[PDB]
Amino acid sequence: LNMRADLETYVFQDNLATAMRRDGEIYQSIVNDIYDVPRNVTITLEDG
């Protein structure tokens, strides 16, 4: 319970010191229009 509690204060500390924290997996970045406009039945760019 304390290890999970130290985790709540880990993230909100570390991310300020280290900076960063725009991370995930695979594609989420680069090519045409911004953010997550799709939504069904569209594949290959024009938001991208």
Partner: protein, 48 residues
């Protein structure tokens, strides 16, 4: 009403915010009261 689809931003629990929030149906019951082992994610329950 039910009975429609729109993959990516499907509704599973999301409700209308109307013109002012804190609105909800009186049907807050859709289940029976039953308990079991602790699970703190949907994927944890799926393992068992």
């Amino acid at each position: 009403s039910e009975k429609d689809v729109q993959l990516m931003a499907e509704v599973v629990d999301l409700a209308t915010g109307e013109k002012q929030v804190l609105n909800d149906i009186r049907g807050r019951y859709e289940c029976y009261t039953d308990v079991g082992p602790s699970f703190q994610s949907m994927k944890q329950q799926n393992r068992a």
